[PDB]
C-alpha cells in the first residue's frame, strides 16, 4: 500500500492540521482481524481444555485471560472503527486498549506466579 506518513490532513474547516500515516485508520483493522480469528480459535481451545487442574489449574487462568482479551477486543474494534475521524482521541483510546490488554494478560496469567512468589 504505502510506507505511511500522510502529512497535511485536509479537514472540513481548514484551521489546524494533523500528522498521520497513509491509511493506518481503516487498513489496520484487517491486520487486527488477522489476529482476532486467531484469538477466537485460541479461546475456543480455552473452552475445550478448560477442565484441566494441571500446573496449579493453569488452564482456567488461560481461559480467563482469553475471555478478558476477547471481550476487550470485541469492545475495541467498533470503537476504533467509528472513531476514525479524530486523531488524538483515536490514538488515545487504541493506546488505552493496548495497555489494558497487556495489563490484563500480565495480571491474569501471572497471577499464580505472583501468588507463589
Amino acid at each position: 500500500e504505502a510506507p505511511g506518513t500522510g502529512k497535511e490532513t485536509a479537514p472540513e474547516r481548514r484551521e489546524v492540521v494533523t500528522l498521520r500515516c497513509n491509511h493506518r485508520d481503516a487498513s489496520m483493522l484487517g491486520s487486527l482481524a488477522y489476529n482476532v480469528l486467531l484469538i477466537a480459535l485460541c479461546t475456543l481451545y480455552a473452552f475445550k481444555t478448560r477442565k484441566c487442574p494441571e500446573n496449579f489449574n493453569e488452564a482456567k487462568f488461560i481461559g480467563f485471560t482469553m475471555y478478558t482479551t476477547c471481550i476487550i477486543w470485541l469492545a475495541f474494534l467498533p470503537i476504533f472503527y467509528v472513531t476514525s475521524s479524530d486523531y488524538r482521541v483515536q490514538t488515545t483510546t487504541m493506546c488505552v486498549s493496548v495497555s489494558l490488554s497487556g495489563s490484563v494478560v500480565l495480571g491474569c496469567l501471572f497471577a499464580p506466579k505472583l501468588h507463589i512468589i
Partner: protein, 63 residues
C-alpha cells in the same frame, strides 16, 4: 469588489482563509495554510501536534 461602474469599490472580506492575490480578485494559493504578517502569506503552517507538550495524553505515557 468592483461594481458596474469603475470609479468606486466596495470593501468586503471574501474569505478569511483565502490568499490575497489582487485588489479585485480573491483566490487561495494552496491548502491548509493561514495568511501571516509577511508579504507572501498563505503559508508557514507547521504540524499542529506538540511532542509530549499537552497534558491530555499523559495517561498512556504513565500506564
Amino acid at each position: 469588489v468592483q461594481p458596474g461602474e469603475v470609479c468606486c469599490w466596495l470593501c468586503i472580506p471574501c474569505q478569511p482563509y483565502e490568499y490575497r492575490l489582487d485588489e479585485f480578485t480573491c483566490a487561495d494559493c494552496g491548502l491548509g495554510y493561514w495568511p501571516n504578517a509577511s508579504l507572501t502569506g498563505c503559508f508557514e503552517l507547521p504540524q499542529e501536534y506538540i511532542r509530549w507538550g499537552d497534558a491530555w495524553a499523559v495517561g498512556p505515557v504513565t500506564i
